[PDB]
Design a protein around this ligand. Sequence first.
Ligand SMILES: N[C@@H](Cc1c[nH]c2cc(Cl)ccc12)C(=O)NC1CCN(Cc2c[nH]c3ccc(Cl)cc23)CC1
Ligand SMILES: Nc1nc2c(ncn2[C@@H]2O[C@H](COP(=O)(O)OP(=O)(O)NP(=O)(O)O)[C@@H](O)[C@H]2O)c(=O)[nH]1
Ligand SMILES: [Mg+2]
Ligand code: NA
Lengths: 167, 166, 469
Amino acid sequence: GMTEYKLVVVGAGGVGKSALTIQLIQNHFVDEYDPTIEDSYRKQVVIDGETCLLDILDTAGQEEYSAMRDQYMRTGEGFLCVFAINNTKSFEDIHQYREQIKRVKDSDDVPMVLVGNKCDLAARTVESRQAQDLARSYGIPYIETSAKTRQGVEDAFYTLVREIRQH
Amino acid sequence: MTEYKLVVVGAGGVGKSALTIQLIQNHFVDEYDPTIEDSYRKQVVIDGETCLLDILDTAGQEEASAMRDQYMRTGEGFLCVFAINNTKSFEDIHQYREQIKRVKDSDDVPMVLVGNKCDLAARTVESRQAQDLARSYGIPYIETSAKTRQGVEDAFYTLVREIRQH
Amino acid sequence: GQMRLPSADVYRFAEPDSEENIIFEEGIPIIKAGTVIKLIERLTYHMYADPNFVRTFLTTYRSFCKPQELLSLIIERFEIPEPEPTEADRIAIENGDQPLSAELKRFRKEYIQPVQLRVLNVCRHWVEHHFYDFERDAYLLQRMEEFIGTVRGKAMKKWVESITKIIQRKKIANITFQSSPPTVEWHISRPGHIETFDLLTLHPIEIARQLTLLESDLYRAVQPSELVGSVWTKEDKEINSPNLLKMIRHTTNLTLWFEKCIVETENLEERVAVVSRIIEILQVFQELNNFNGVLEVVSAMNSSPVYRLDHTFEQIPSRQKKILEEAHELSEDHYKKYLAKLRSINPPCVPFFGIYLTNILKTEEGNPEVLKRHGKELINFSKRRKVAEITGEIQQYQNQPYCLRVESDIKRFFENLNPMGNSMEKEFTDYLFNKSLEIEPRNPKPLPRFPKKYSYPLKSPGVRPSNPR
Ligand SMILES: N[C@@H](Cc1c[nH]c2cc(Cl)ccc12)C(=O)NC1CCN(Cc2c[nH]c3ccc(Cl)cc23)CC1
Ligand SMILES: Nc1nc2c(ncn2[C@@H]2O[C@H](COP(=O)(O)OP(=O)(O)NP(=O)(O)O)[C@@H](O)[C@H]2O)c(=O)[nH]1
Ligand SMILES: [Mg+2]
Ligand code: NA
């Protein structure tokens, strides 16, 4: 039947990365979540008129298990590389995440999107022009998202699915 | 995984807590810290079937004697514990048996009679007297030592089997 | 009829339940949300005990109430006013007779004594299982000692004297088995010859046993204080989650050691022996229910430097291929088969901690701290219950000890393992990948030959245990 896309979220810990998938998969309109529930990470969606199933791997909280990253990344067809717009270190980490994905997938052209996440009201330290320039240097889209209002969340995942479809 | 609610009852100081902690942690508690109410969980395979035991460890001191109905309502099987060197604790058994029957409104509640502290030489309750009482209740009698582990798994897992077959 | 209660003006915990102060989930009730006063009332309720609730509350309350404020509130809960004499008591006293005091005696027996005992049970659990609050705030401990040490009256006396002693023991602060542990197994390396210890010279059975003891001890040392509030992900993680981080860093180091043993063995035949030996260690991990160890091996086999070694894995015996396959399948479909296996085995076991961490973090991040109802903010307690269900599962597997004997020299060897040396992570993992490219170059480059590095026999002793008399 319908195509299933295996997406993997990667990025620094401790800066709200998990809000991206929670807000997507959530009952959009009730703020509640049980991640232990069978298929709290699967969602059927319609993108450009084509129905598909998203299976999202987000291992948020396991960042210290650094030798497991290869195993987790190997499962994915497309990747969201997430940093926090108020944490410059998480932005500087993006280069090494992308290099690791390319190595695990043994490809120089892996479907991926760069996501800048607004996780609180603390002062932004990564300007949108900096992130756009980085994304353009890689040849990938850039999407900004809010961890509180759900803005940009659908755009981030749907843009990634379009990258997979057009690979 | 089937869940079983076990309740350990009996007079103060007979070893209800020591029995439970020996089962849960393989450790013998030397201290006598009177319980108010404690609860433990244990995943264990019994007769090839995995289950989850919820064990309620209750207060034996008489000052808590008006607070028992609430835990007897929830329990599915009861370990009725006395100490084999304490005749008064053996005489207290029938009061627990009768209260459990009243609260659950049932003549057929899963129970095991436990004679604890069987590592001690100076016994004052003979096995035969306890076995006679158990037969009158229709339940097994198992002697245990929380100190050495003798009989401890047998007592708890026999109770599980009686809940399973209930 | 129900007992009458003190006036809510003199005793705050007598206010009637309403949706402005407590909400229940759809046979004791389960609380969805409430004010802190209502949560403490139900924590110490006169009609029933709720030991699960005591654990849940004491594990999670600091997200909505400070420790000093909790102690003030339970002391306020404890201090219950007694009712005045009734009309019948009055008439008896006016006639020089002793009153029956029926209503007073019932209120003492059915309200004051159960509530007070349940307050003391909160104090007892707090000191026994959440003592870190008092280690970190000496004044909080002084207040608790003073409160307990000044409770009067004989109904509570046994528990007050007991709790006083428990506190004093905690301030200055043995396993028995059904059988004997199996005999320690030795291979090329003999007892006391620590300088020869290595992957292929220690007995694979004993490698798996000693790593299981080490990993079990690390698992058992993690307290809920290192987990609630997602503190292991935050800037102060080294302060707040040291035992968890030690456990994870051990797992990472062993995975990297496995990778390093493989790719630094340049001779193909020797490297096949190394990979085969690691799969035998994995087989014993499975037999011991050491799932952390199972995944340490699987993560190494799936790493970028090792996964690509097609010439090596082509020579692995078919049965060992099947062992690795079925270990890898535990992690597929978001750990579906792992979760089912963990819930079916007979402990002792060593769970993989990472799933717990992700579920705690997402429960915290995905649910609001408060619910707004009728203009009031109520503490979202359902969210805290979900977190404590996870910490309760963790604790349940921390109870059962392994019946295995420690070998102090093998233990020290694995405690001191340091595959990265002084190198930084990126440096080191690039080194491992470049070694992989050296020993099995990318097609169409030809496969080179390399000299042997091991002077001792490569044949495994196998993983079935031996038993002399
Ligand atoms: N259809 C199989 C047949 C097969 C040939 N050789 C094998 C060796 C094994 Cl052990 C299992 C299967 C095979 C295939 O061609 N698999 C390719 C090449 C072999 N790698 C082995 C590998 C390395 N790291 C791993 C981590 C987990 C797991 Cl499950 C396997 C591995 C996997 C990718
Ligand atoms: N020799 C021996 N001592 C035991 C045994 N079981 C318990 N004890 C000792 O008896 C004392 C009381 O044990 P405890 O478990 O606290 O009893 P309890 O029935 O839980 N008391 P309470 O009803 O007040 O909670 C402790 O000193 C304990 O070490 C046993 O099998 N053998
Ligand atoms: Mg006790
Ligand atoms: Na910054």
